[PDB]
Design a protein around this ligand. Structure first.
Ligand code: HEM
Ligand code: Z7Z
Ligand code: CL
Length: 393
């Protein structure tokens, strides 16, 4: 009753161009079985949204990667937030929500915006730049480690660590195994910076430790919650901003609309998240036999969600394959949905907004002027190199 497909959603061929295979997965049925990895798959918006919004049946505490923590040992101690279900999830979630809250955004917005403006001015002086290394990477590296309260030394470990985290949600293919083989120095750096003495006053890390006396988290929980921000808080935004610039380079008509109304910057970034979902896939595990879309899935089964596919499903979106900065993006799943929906989304949106605002006000054209190279990761989607010429406004 459930179609079986041989598509490998963690192959380089899939990463190179996932859209035809995603349509194949959507059109095969609401629920598919992926023989390559012995997991169920859901690629339509309706089922992805339903799975995300039933955490009791589709749990996260057995891992949101291929590995089932009930069968195999996690490669690192489980996350107290991502890899937790309610009720254990609830108070750590509440702490990170307050740390990454509107009030915090107000304290950091001016500095984040100045840094975006300054970066665009710098890039305009160079003219020809790599929008990944020089912009998508450089801008978040210029604001987020400092907002965390990290020392300067060792920040070169942050992107490798995140690439490891997101590769480790995949199956035991070469991307994952190579990442784990090389991981020891990055893990050692990250774990050490999670300790309260290594996090500067006023930053996100220190704020997490300052929440350890309310009864929400204990002091021994705070280093792992800092670890969560050092895992998810940088590489995601690198790929999101890279996606937005890639979209504006490929859709010059939308760059021109954005120039004419820079207050579209925040929605232009949100549409980039929908269109080029930086996080493409991850898993849940069933806690019982469950009927989904008309198929019966047994207990203890991994269910792979295709977030990028759900965000391009024509059952939900009009012209899903168009980048439209005035689209009503409400409901996209690029930040997830439900109780685990990205707790850092206000930081992500702030970065993306202020960067796209700076481009809207300062740049007249973005022209690809060199070979574009993709960066392969088991769950993140984005580019390795994006050579562009920036023309000043
Ligand atoms: C464009 C940038 C980003 C994207 C696309 C993104 C995407 C996501 C998604 C899809 C989830 C849901 C995971 C799940 O349901 O299992 C999530 C959760 C999470 N994200 Fe984000 N994220 C971004 C930026 C950030 C930032 C900047 C931070 C921190 C500063 C962050 C921290 C987290 C954390 C801690 C969780 C787990 C929340 C929970 O389990 O309750 N993310 N993110
Ligand atoms: O370490 C964490 O808590 C953490 C790691 C990865 C993520 C993540 C974000 C988006 C998609 C999948 C996973 C969230 C939290
Ligand atoms: Cl670690």
């Amino acid at each position: 009753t459930i179609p079986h497909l041989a598509i490998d959603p963690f192959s380089l061929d899939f990463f190179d161009d996932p859209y035809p295979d995603q349509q194949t997965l959507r059109d095969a049925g609401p629920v598919v079985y992926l023989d390559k990895w012995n997991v169920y798959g859901v690629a339509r918006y309706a089922e992805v949204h339903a799975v995300l919004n039933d955490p009791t049946t589709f749990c996260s505490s057995r891992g949101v990667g291929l590995s089932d923590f009930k069968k195999e040992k996690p490669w690192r101690p489980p996350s107290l937030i991502l890899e937790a279900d309610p009720p254990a999830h609830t108070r750590p979630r509440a702490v990170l929500s307050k740390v990454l809250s509107p009030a915090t955004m107000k304290t950091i917005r001016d500095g984040f915006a100045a840094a975006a403006d300054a970066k665009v001015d710098e890039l305009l002086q160079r003219g020809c730049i790599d929008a990944i290394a020089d912009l998508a990477e450089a801008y978040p590296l210029s604001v987020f480690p400092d907002a965390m309260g990290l020392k300067q030394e060792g920040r070169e470990h942050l992107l490798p660590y995140a690439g490891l985290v997101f590769n480790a949600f995949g199956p035991p293919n070469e991307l994952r195994q190579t990442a784990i083989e090389r991981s020891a120095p990055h893990q050692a750096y990250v774990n050490e910076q999670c300790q309260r003495p290594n996090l500067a006053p006023g930053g996100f890390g220190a704020c997490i430790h300052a929440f350890t006396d309310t009864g929400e988290i204990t002091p021994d929980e705070a280093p792992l919650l800092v670890r969560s921000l050092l895992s998810a808080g940088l590489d995601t935004t690198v790929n999101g901003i890279g996606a937005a610039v890639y979209c504006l380079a490929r859709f010059p008509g939308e760059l021109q609309r954005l120039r004419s109304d820079p207050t579209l910057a925040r929605n232009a970034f949100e549409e980039a998240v929908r269109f080029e979902s930086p996080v493409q896939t991850f898993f849940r595990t069933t806690t019982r036999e469950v009927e989904l879309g008309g198929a019966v899935i047994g207990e203890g089964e991994k269910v792979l969600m295709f977030l990028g596919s759900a965000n391009r499903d024509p059952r939900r979106w009009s012209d899903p394959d168009l980048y439209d900065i005035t689209r009503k993006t409400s409901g996209h799943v690029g930040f997830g949905s439900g109780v685990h929906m990205c707790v850092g989304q206000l930081v992500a949106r702030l970065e993306g907004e202020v960067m796209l605002s700076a481009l809207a006000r300062k740049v007249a054209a973005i022209d690809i002027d060199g070979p574009v190279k993709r960066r392969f990761n088991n769950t993140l989607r984005g580019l390795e190199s994006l050579p562009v010429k920036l023309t000043p406004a």
